[PDB]
């Protein structure tokens, strides 16, 4: 239609800027990264945003609300993703044997 073609345009053309993530990663490493790191790390974070919004619209469709996304559907989105191990936290030393 005429909205699906505009939505497909924003699904492809949108990206995080490489001039800021290269500034963001290098504040964590200390020295330097490469261009093929920033190209991949800018691409995984678009999949991760698409992992949340496609699942936060499943929370909103499950409850009785409309397309505008309140934060109620966004804290619930991170809760359901973390219970399936999708959201990694490297500060919780987990233990499976008890």
């Amino acid at each position: 239609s005429e909205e699906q073609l505009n939505r497909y345009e924003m699904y492809r053309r949108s990206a995080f800027p490489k001039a800021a993530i290269k500034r963001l990663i290098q504040s964590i490493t200390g020295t330097s990264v490469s261009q093929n790191v920033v190209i991949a790390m800018s691409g995984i974070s678009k999949v991760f945003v698409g992992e949340v919004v496609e699942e936060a619209l499943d929370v909103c469709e499950k409850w009785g609300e409309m397309p505008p996304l309140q934060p109620k559907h966004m804290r619930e989105a991170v809760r359901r993703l973390k219970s399936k191990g999708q959201i990694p936290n490297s500060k919780h030393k987990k233990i499976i044997f008890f």
Binding site: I44, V53, P67
Partner: protein, 80 residues
């Protein structure tokens, strides 16, 4: 901290079906989630492989388990 992903993330939520005009608080939650994800991936990458260096190989091992993200990394590298 200011918001470094305020205008970029509003195009992306529209790309996955949200609205043309999302809420500022929802955009803020998404920006915080993206920063936390990038930080976690960078620490694990520094630990795995060459200590103190984050490489594409380390990032690929880290994302190997999740199918959607692994496919995207491979496609982007091949297209590049």
């Amino acid at each position: 901290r200011k918001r470094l992903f305020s205008k970029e993330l509003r195009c992306m939520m529209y790309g996955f079906g949200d609205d043309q005009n999302p809420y500022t608080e929802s955009v803020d939650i998404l920006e915080d989630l993206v920063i936390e994800f990038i930080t976690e991936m960078t620490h694990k990458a520094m630990s795995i492989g060459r200590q103190g260096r984050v490489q594409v190989e380390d990032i690929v091992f880290l994302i190997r388990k999740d199918p959607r993200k692994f496919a995207r990394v491979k496609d982007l590298l091949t297209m590049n």
